[PDB]
Design a binder for this molecule. Structure first.
Ligand SMILES: CCCCCCCCO[C@@H]1O[C@H](CO)[C@@H](O)[C@H](O)[C@H]1O
Ligand SMILES: CCCCCCCCO[C@@H]1O[C@H](CO)[C@@H](O)[C@H](O)[C@H]1O
Lengths: 301, 301
């Protein structure tokens, strides 16, 4: 069952039942309420994308350089969330990994439909790779994201094959495409914070037509060739409609010869890292991310 | 684990690794080896379809009329199987249900691509409904099929809304559309008679393009409205890549207010009803089908 702590929270975001502005506001207040751990320096920058000027926030750790750079893509169903609501989580990650984190404000739906978020996410990653020197970031680049952001991170890793050299991909309860059949999707369709009704609404805002469901930049799990992608850490949550599809993607990567550490956090729900001050398991997931990135960037414990 | 009987069989059909003719031959010899239980009368007929003359075999039970009529759509990945290979199973079903069974030779891929099988299956069902008197079949019509045939049966039930009155749908380890993510699909991808490599090959023969994956006549589980469909008996197998998607469809029907009895036969594989002389559980599944149809057609135990 759910951790009693989480059950108590759920019993005590109205996607599709309030205006876009109102749902965005509600999420901002939930996510940004978490404590902001001190980092060494924070800078807001503008990345020149192919289609837009992309805002991003750069977090520097207290540890001395040189650093690896983690590009972070926030979740929120391609519609809600932003860099500022994810500030507490990105600070926590910065401190865990002793690395630079660059959180990207990719274009959101409904204002900008698919593939806008993908284009911005890839363009940002490409620019950061080519400008690692600006961050004393010569130990390399990795990509991470949660939920919709995990989708984007997985897709960026695909698009980066033969263009950039990503060291790692961190997929935090990722969405990996169209799923009408998995047990977790059916079973945890209602009552676990992210619902099927929400999922459907997000999809209706982001995608242009059903054909986009079959585009690998939405459904990376149908990509022709997953071989040669960066090693992955894939975190899933036991009581999450997206659980089975995340674990499916892990299995497909493994079958393609890509190293994958796939870990299911039991007793928790989608979004649990955003709730780290309340949900202890969220702190431990952040710590696991830290371990993996300190090893890949620095060869450190 | 698998029933040891089945493990022993598997250890002792080369889809995609032999010619279409050769795979068809191999399946014919496996399936048609089962005993042919006596029925009262067998007749071959021709049904005038919208696009072709459709061959079908009619089995009459020893019980006296009047009868219900079960339209049966064989499996084989839309490529293999035929009425004659399914003769032993259809005879077994006839005797279990005390009803008329009409087994349909729908057009097969690669010679005829999607939606040919669907068109023939629906046309046959429509003609039988309108000609029940020819079979002393006034107790009504139901639809059934296994695997690819379960797909067709589910789709026929959808297409029949507002056109015909089906009493029941029997979906025997059905395929219900595109699935890149379910646990059963991933876990039982290899070594359980039907494999993912097979599934992919069948799909490549039947579908015209990826867009067909999103057509409700291939993926009934994405249909807009499942309400008002006939009551269902859905049989799944524990060690079957299609298991989770069949159970998903059951859940979606239930949520739409359609009566569903969803039963997972443990310890067995896809196709187990075709192996009834060896696999006892297959005989018991046939018996369950019998119970449900004697009740719906005759209000009998
Ligand atoms: C957590 C965020 C993941 C969102 C996944 C969306 C799954 C696909 O969303 C679907 O696609 C179609 C295209 O708009 C629409 O017809 C439907 O609204 C929706 O069911
Ligand atoms: C047991 C029979 C069920 C067959 C299910 C097929 C699942 C979809 O099949 C897919 O669709 C595409 C269209 O041809 C192809 O690109 C691929 O071959 C295949 O993966």
């Amino acid at each position: 069952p759910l951790d009693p702590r989480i059950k108590k929270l759920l019993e005590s975001v109205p996607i599709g039942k309030a205006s876009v502005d109102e749902v965005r506001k509600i999420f901002r207040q939930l996510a940004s309420a978490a404590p902001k751990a001190e980092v060494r320096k924070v800078e807001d920058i503008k990345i020149p994308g192919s289609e837009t000027s992309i805002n991003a926030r750069v977090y520097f750790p207290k540890a001395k350089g040189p650093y690896g750079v983690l590009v972070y893509l926030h979740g929120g169903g391609f519609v809600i969330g932003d860099v500022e609501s994810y500030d507490p989580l990105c600070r926590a990650i910065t401190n865990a990994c002793n690395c630079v984190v660059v959180s990207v404000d990719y274009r959101l739906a409904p204002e900008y439909k698919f593939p806008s978020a993908v284009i911005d996410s890839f363009d940002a990653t490409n620019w950061i790779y080519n400008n690692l020197d600006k961050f004393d970031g010569e130990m390399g680049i990795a990509i991470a994201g949660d939920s919709a952001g995990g989708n984007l991170a997985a897709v960026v890793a695909l698009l980066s094959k033969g263009k950039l050299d990503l060291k790692y991909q961190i997929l935090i309860y990722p969405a990996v495409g169209f799923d009408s059949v998995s047990r977790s999707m059916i079973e945890y369709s209602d009552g676990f914070f992210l619902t099927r009704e929400h999922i459907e609404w997000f999809g209706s805002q982001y995608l242009r037509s059903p054909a986009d469901l079959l585009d690998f930049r939405f459904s990376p799990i149908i990509a022709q060739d997953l071989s040669g992608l960066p090693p992955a850490l894939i975190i899933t949550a036991e009581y999450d409609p997206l659980r089975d599809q995340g674990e499916a993607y892990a299995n497909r990567l493994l079958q393609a010869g890509v190293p994958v550490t796939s870990v299911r956090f039991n007793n928790v729900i989608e979004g649990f890292l955003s709730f780290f001050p309340l949900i202890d398991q969220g702190k431990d997931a952040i710590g696991l991310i830290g371990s993996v990135l300190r090893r890949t960037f620095y060869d450190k414990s």
